[PDB]
Ligand binder design. Structure first.
Ligand SMILES: O=C(O)c1c(C[C@@H]2C(=O)Nc3ccccc32)ccc2c1OCO2
Ligand SMILES: O=C(O)c1c(C[C@@H]2C(=O)Nc3ccccc32)ccc2c1OCO2
Lengths: 148, 148
Protein backbone atom coordinates (compact mmCIF):
# COMPACT_ATOMS: atom_id res chain seq x y z
CA UNK A 1 0.00 0.00 0.00
CA UNK A 2 1.02 3.67 -0.38
CA UNK A 3 2.23 4.09 3.23
CA UNK A 4 4.35 0.95 3.74
CA UNK A 5 8.13 1.24 4.19
CA UNK A 6 10.84 -1.30 5.06
CA UNK A 7 14.00 -0.59 7.04
CA UNK A 8 17.24 -2.16 5.85
CA UNK A 9 20.73 -1.95 7.36
CA UNK A 10 23.88 -2.82 5.37
CA UNK A 11 27.64 -2.43 6.03
CA UNK A 12 30.45 -0.76 4.04
CA UNK A 13 33.91 0.71 4.89
CA UNK A 14 33.47 -0.09 8.60
CA UNK A 15 30.29 2.00 8.68
CA UNK A 16 26.56 1.32 8.46
CA UNK A 17 24.18 2.44 5.71
CA UNK A 18 20.62 2.72 6.99
CA UNK A 19 18.03 2.47 4.21
CA UNK A 20 14.28 2.97 4.06
CA UNK A 21 12.57 1.39 1.05
CA UNK A 22 9.09 2.33 -0.12
CA UNK A 23 7.97 -1.21 -0.84
CA UNK A 24 5.44 -0.58 -3.65
CA UNK A 25 7.79 1.68 -5.70
CA UNK A 26 11.38 0.69 -4.83
CA UNK A 27 12.13 4.34 -3.91
CA UNK A 28 14.78 4.74 -1.20
CA UNK A 29 16.17 7.18 1.31
CA UNK A 30 19.48 6.38 3.00
CA UNK A 31 22.06 7.70 5.44
CA UNK A 32 25.49 6.69 6.73
CA UNK A 33 25.87 6.26 10.51
CA UNK A 34 28.75 4.89 12.62
CA UNK A 35 26.59 2.02 13.88
CA UNK A 36 22.93 1.08 14.14
CA UNK A 37 21.46 2.40 17.37
CA UNK A 38 17.88 3.07 18.48
CA UNK A 39 18.70 6.78 18.63
CA UNK A 40 19.96 6.89 15.01
CA UNK A 41 17.04 4.77 13.78
CA UNK A 42 14.50 6.96 15.62
CA UNK A 43 15.93 10.16 14.12
CA UNK A 44 16.04 8.63 10.61
CA UNK A 45 12.35 7.63 10.88
CA UNK A 46 11.37 11.10 12.07
CA UNK A 47 13.11 12.62 9.02
CA UNK A 48 11.45 10.11 6.69
CA UNK A 49 7.95 10.66 8.07
CA UNK A 50 8.21 14.45 7.74
CA UNK A 51 8.97 14.00 4.04
CA UNK A 52 6.61 11.15 2.95
CA UNK A 53 3.28 9.88 4.38
CA UNK A 54 4.70 6.94 6.35
CA UNK A 55 1.91 4.75 7.79
CA UNK A 56 3.70 1.48 8.46
CA UNK A 57 7.38 0.59 8.94
CA UNK A 58 8.67 -2.97 8.88
CA UNK A 59 11.66 -2.73 11.21
CA UNK A 60 14.92 -4.40 10.18
CA UNK A 61 15.64 -6.38 13.38
CA UNK A 62 14.39 -7.16 16.87
CA UNK A 63 16.61 -4.61 18.61
CA UNK A 64 15.09 -1.69 16.68
CA UNK A 65 11.63 -3.25 17.10
CA UNK A 66 12.16 -3.37 20.89
CA UNK A 67 13.94 0.01 21.24
CA UNK A 68 11.99 2.45 23.44
CA UNK A 69 13.50 5.38 21.49
CA UNK A 70 12.33 3.92 18.15
CA UNK A 71 8.91 3.31 19.72
CA UNK A 72 8.82 6.96 20.88
CA UNK A 73 9.61 8.23 17.38
CA UNK A 74 7.00 5.97 15.82
CA UNK A 75 4.42 7.20 18.35
CA UNK A 76 5.36 10.84 17.73
CA UNK A 77 5.21 10.54 13.93
CA UNK A 78 2.06 8.34 13.79
CA UNK A 79 3.87 5.30 12.39
CA UNK A 80 2.71 1.73 13.00
CA UNK A 81 5.82 -0.24 13.85
CA UNK A 82 5.76 -3.85 12.61
CA UNK A 83 8.25 -6.69 12.53
CA UNK A 84 10.00 -7.21 9.17
CA UNK A 85 9.65 -10.98 9.20
CA UNK A 86 9.41 -12.07 5.55
CA UNK A 87 6.45 -14.47 5.61
CA UNK A 88 6.65 -14.00 1.84
CA UNK A 89 10.27 -15.13 1.26
CA UNK A 90 10.82 -13.26 -2.04
CA UNK A 91 10.80 -10.09 0.12
CA UNK A 92 14.17 -10.83 1.79
CA UNK A 93 15.89 -11.68 -1.53
CA UNK A 94 14.65 -8.40 -3.03
CA UNK A 95 16.31 -6.50 -0.13
CA UNK A 96 19.49 -8.59 -0.58
CA UNK A 97 19.59 -7.71 -4.31
CA UNK A 98 18.99 -4.02 -3.52
CA UNK A 99 21.92 -3.91 -1.09
CA UNK A 100 24.13 -5.54 -3.75
CA UNK A 101 22.83 -3.08 -6.36
CA UNK A 102 23.38 -0.06 -4.07
CA UNK A 103 26.89 -1.23 -3.27
CA UNK A 104 27.63 -1.61 -6.98
CA UNK A 105 26.51 1.97 -7.64
CA UNK A 106 28.51 3.20 -4.66
CA UNK A 107 31.57 1.52 -6.20
CA UNK A 108 30.87 3.24 -9.54
CA UNK A 109 30.78 6.72 -7.92
CA UNK A 110 33.14 6.17 -5.01
CA UNK A 111 36.13 8.00 -6.55
CA UNK A 112 34.01 11.11 -7.23
CA UNK A 113 33.57 11.78 -3.50
CA UNK A 114 36.00 12.14 -0.61
CA UNK A 115 33.41 10.90 1.93
CA UNK A 116 31.30 7.75 1.91
CA UNK A 117 28.17 9.70 2.82
CA UNK A 118 28.44 11.64 -0.44
CA UNK A 119 28.88 8.43 -2.48
CA UNK A 120 25.80 6.98 -0.76
CA UNK A 121 23.69 10.05 -1.65
CA UNK A 122 24.93 9.83 -5.27
CA UNK A 123 23.84 6.19 -5.25
CA UNK A 124 20.41 7.15 -3.84
CA UNK A 125 20.09 9.67 -6.69
CA UNK A 126 21.03 7.16 -9.38
CA UNK A 127 18.78 4.47 -7.86
CA UNK A 128 15.71 6.70 -7.64
CA UNK A 129 16.14 8.22 -11.13
CA UNK A 130 16.85 4.96 -13.04
CA UNK A 131 14.01 4.07 -15.44
CA UNK A 132 13.08 0.38 -15.74
CA UNK A 133 9.07 4.66 -15.00
CA UNK A 134 11.63 5.40 -12.27
CA UNK A 135 11.20 4.66 -8.58
CA UNK A 136 10.84 8.41 -7.95
CA UNK A 137 8.06 8.59 -10.52
CA UNK A 138 6.35 5.46 -9.13
CA UNK A 139 6.20 6.71 -5.51
CA UNK A 140 4.75 10.08 -6.55
CA UNK A 141 2.10 8.37 -8.72
CA UNK A 142 1.17 5.85 -6.01
CA UNK A 143 0.73 8.55 -3.36
CA UNK A 144 -1.07 11.02 -5.67
CA UNK A 145 -3.54 8.28 -6.62
CA UNK A 146 -4.08 7.55 -2.90
CA UNK A 147 -4.75 11.26 -2.21
CA UNK A 148 -7.38 11.55 -5.01
CA UNK B 1 7.21 25.18 -11.96
CA UNK B 2 7.12 21.60 -10.53
CA UNK B 3 10.95 21.59 -10.35
CA UNK B 4 11.67 24.97 -8.72
CA UNK B 5 13.14 25.16 -5.20
CA UNK B 6 14.42 28.05 -3.06
CA UNK B 7 17.24 27.86 -0.54
CA UNK B 8 16.80 29.67 2.77
CA UNK B 9 19.19 29.97 5.71
CA UNK B 10 18.04 31.00 9.21
CA UNK B 11 19.72 31.09 12.65
CA UNK B 12 18.76 29.59 16.04
CA UNK B 13 20.66 28.58 19.23
CA UNK B 14 24.01 29.63 17.71
CA UNK B 15 23.46 27.22 14.82
CA UNK B 16 22.17 27.47 11.26
CA UNK B 17 19.03 25.86 9.83
CA UNK B 18 19.33 25.30 6.10
CA UNK B 19 15.95 25.04 4.37
CA UNK B 20 14.85 24.10 0.86
CA UNK B 21 11.34 25.24 -0.08
CA UNK B 22 9.40 23.82 -3.00
CA UNK B 23 8.01 27.14 -4.17
CA UNK B 24 4.71 26.01 -5.75
CA UNK B 25 3.63 23.85 -2.75
CA UNK B 26 5.31 25.31 0.37
CA UNK B 27 6.80 21.86 1.14
CA UNK B 28 10.15 21.97 2.96
CA UNK B 29 13.19 19.92 3.79
CA UNK B 30 15.61 21.22 6.42
CA UNK B 31 18.79 20.39 8.32
CA UNK B 32 20.83 21.88 11.15
CA UNK B 33 24.50 22.66 10.43
CA UNK B 34 27.13 24.52 12.50
CA UNK B 35 27.45 27.24 9.84
CA UNK B 36 26.60 27.78 6.18
CA UNK B 37 29.46 26.58 3.99
CA UNK B 38 29.62 25.62 0.31
CA UNK B 39 30.40 22.05 1.37
CA UNK B 40 27.29 21.77 3.58
CA UNK B 41 25.10 23.44 0.96
CA UNK B 42 26.42 21.14 -1.80
CA UNK B 43 25.72 18.02 0.25
CA UNK B 44 22.22 19.24 1.20
CA UNK B 45 21.38 19.84 -2.49
CA UNK B 46 22.64 16.40 -3.47
CA UNK B 47 20.35 14.84 -0.82
CA UNK B 48 17.40 16.94 -1.99
CA UNK B 49 17.84 16.13 -5.67
CA UNK B 50 18.01 12.37 -5.01
CA UNK B 51 14.63 12.59 -3.29
CA UNK B 52 12.64 15.06 -5.48
CA UNK B 53 12.98 16.07 -9.17
CA UNK B 54 14.91 19.30 -8.62
CA UNK B 55 15.30 21.27 -11.86
CA UNK B 56 16.06 24.77 -10.61
CA UNK B 57 17.41 26.11 -7.33
CA UNK B 58 17.31 29.78 -6.35
CA UNK B 59 20.36 30.06 -4.11
CA UNK B 60 20.08 31.99 -0.84
CA UNK B 61 23.10 34.29 -1.21
CA UNK B 62 26.01 35.23 -3.44
CA UNK B 63 28.56 33.09 -1.59
CA UNK B 64 26.62 29.87 -2.26
CA UNK B 65 25.94 31.06 -5.82
CA UNK B 66 29.68 31.55 -6.38
CA UNK B 67 30.87 28.43 -4.49
CA UNK B 68 32.73 25.99 -6.75
CA UNK B 69 31.60 23.10 -4.52
CA UNK B 70 27.92 24.13 -4.83
CA UNK B 71 28.43 24.47 -8.59
CA UNK B 72 29.94 20.96 -8.70
CA UNK B 73 26.93 19.50 -6.86
CA UNK B 74 24.49 21.30 -9.13
CA UNK B 75 26.35 20.02 -12.20
CA UNK B 76 26.42 16.47 -10.82
CA UNK B 77 22.71 16.43 -9.92
CA UNK B 78 21.48 18.25 -13.08
CA UNK B 79 20.29 21.34 -11.22
CA UNK B 80 20.16 24.79 -12.81
CA UNK B 81 21.60 27.17 -10.23
CA UNK B 82 20.00 30.62 -10.25
CA UNK B 83 20.30 33.71 -8.09
CA UNK B 84 17.50 34.14 -5.53
CA UNK B 85 17.04 37.84 -6.22
CA UNK B 86 13.37 38.58 -5.51
CA UNK B 87 12.36 40.60 -8.58
CA UNK B 88 8.87 39.85 -7.28
CA UNK B 89 9.17 41.36 -3.76
CA UNK B 90 6.36 39.31 -2.13
CA UNK B 91 8.77 36.36 -2.46
CA UNK B 92 11.10 37.65 0.30
CA UNK B 93 8.29 38.34 2.75
CA UNK B 94 6.92 34.83 2.22
CA UNK B 95 10.34 33.36 3.18
CA UNK B 96 10.50 35.72 6.17
CA UNK B 97 7.07 34.56 7.37
CA UNK B 98 8.08 30.92 6.89
CA UNK B 99 11.21 31.34 9.03
CA UNK B 100 9.08 32.96 11.76
CA UNK B 101 6.50 30.18 11.44
CA UNK B 102 9.17 27.44 11.57
CA UNK B 103 10.75 29.04 14.62
CA UNK B 104 7.35 29.20 16.32
CA UNK B 105 6.83 25.48 15.73
CA UNK B 106 10.35 24.72 16.93
CA UNK B 107 9.50 26.60 20.14
CA UNK B 108 6.31 24.53 20.53
CA UNK B 109 8.22 21.21 20.29
CA UNK B 110 11.58 22.27 21.70
CA UNK B 111 11.11 20.65 25.14
CA UNK B 112 10.23 17.28 23.56
CA UNK B 113 13.76 16.88 22.16
CA UNK B 114 17.21 17.02 23.70
CA UNK B 115 18.82 18.17 20.43
CA UNK B 116 17.89 21.07 18.16
CA UNK B 117 18.14 18.87 15.06
CA UNK B 118 15.29 16.71 16.39
CA UNK B 119 13.10 19.77 17.10
CA UNK B 120 13.77 21.01 13.56
CA UNK B 121 12.69 17.67 12.05
CA UNK B 122 9.54 17.72 14.21
CA UNK B 123 8.86 21.21 12.86
CA UNK B 124 9.41 20.00 9.26
CA UNK B 125 6.87 17.23 9.96
CA UNK B 126 4.26 19.59 11.40
CA UNK B 127 4.81 22.13 8.60
CA UNK B 128 4.46 19.59 5.79
CA UNK B 129 1.40 17.83 7.30
CA UNK B 130 -0.60 20.98 8.23
CA UNK B 131 -3.76 21.33 6.12
CA UNK B 132 -4.17 24.90 4.96
CA UNK B 133 -4.60 20.26 1.30
CA UNK B 134 -1.22 20.03 3.07
CA UNK B 135 2.11 21.04 1.56
CA UNK B 136 3.03 17.34 1.35
CA UNK B 137 -0.15 16.64 -0.59
CA UNK B 138 0.38 19.67 -2.86
CA UNK B 139 3.94 18.72 -3.90
CA UNK B 140 2.93 15.13 -4.73
CA UNK B 141 -0.04 16.35 -6.81
CA UNK B 142 2.02 18.97 -8.66
CA UNK B 143 4.73 16.47 -9.58
CA UNK B 144 2.32 13.64 -10.47
CA UNK B 145 0.45 15.99 -12.80
CA UNK B 146 3.77 16.98 -14.40
CA UNK B 147 4.68 13.29 -14.94
CA UNK B 148 1.43 12.59 -16.86
O1 LIG C 1 16.12 13.83 22.22
C1 LIG C 1 16.44 13.91 21.00
O2 LIG C 1 16.71 14.99 20.41
C2 LIG C 1 16.51 12.65 20.20
C3 LIG C 1 15.63 11.57 20.33
C4 LIG C 1 14.49 11.52 21.30
C5 LIG C 1 13.35 12.44 20.91
C6 LIG C 1 12.29 12.44 21.98
O3 LIG C 1 12.50 12.66 23.16
N1 LIG C 1 11.07 12.14 21.40
C7 LIG C 1 11.23 11.92 20.04
C8 LIG C 1 10.27 11.60 19.12
C9 LIG C 1 10.66 11.42 17.82
C10 LIG C 1 11.99 11.55 17.46
C11 LIG C 1 12.94 11.88 18.40
C12 LIG C 1 12.55 12.06 19.71
C13 LIG C 1 15.78 10.44 19.54
C14 LIG C 1 16.79 10.34 18.59
C15 LIG C 1 17.64 11.41 18.48
C16 LIG C 1 17.50 12.51 19.26
O4 LIG C 1 18.46 13.45 18.96
C17 LIG C 1 19.02 12.87 17.78
O5 LIG C 1 18.69 11.50 17.61
O1 LIG D 1 33.90 15.09 -1.54
C1 LIG D 1 32.84 14.95 -0.88
O2 LIG D 1 32.47 13.85 -0.36
C2 LIG D 1 31.95 16.13 -0.68
C3 LIG D 1 31.71 17.12 -1.63
C4 LIG D 1 32.32 17.16 -3.00
C5 LIG D 1 31.76 16.08 -3.90
C6 LIG D 1 32.52 16.06 -5.21
O3 LIG D 1 33.74 16.00 -5.30
N1 LIG D 1 31.61 16.12 -6.25
C7 LIG D 1 30.33 16.25 -5.74
C8 LIG D 1 29.17 16.36 -6.46
C9 LIG D 1 27.99 16.48 -5.75
C10 LIG D 1 28.01 16.49 -4.37
C11 LIG D 1 29.19 16.37 -3.67
C12 LIG D 1 30.36 16.25 -4.38
C13 LIG D 1 30.88 18.19 -1.34
C14 LIG D 1 30.25 18.30 -0.11
C15 LIG D 1 30.49 17.32 0.81
C16 LIG D 1 31.31 16.28 0.54
O4 LIG D 1 31.40 15.43 1.61
C17 LIG D 1 30.35 15.95 2.44
O5 LIG D 1 29.96 17.26 2.07
Amino acid sequence: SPGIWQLDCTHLEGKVILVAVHVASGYIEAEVIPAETGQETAYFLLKLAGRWPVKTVHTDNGSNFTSTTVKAACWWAGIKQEDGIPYNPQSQGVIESMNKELKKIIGQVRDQAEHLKTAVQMAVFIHNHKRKYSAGERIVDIIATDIQ
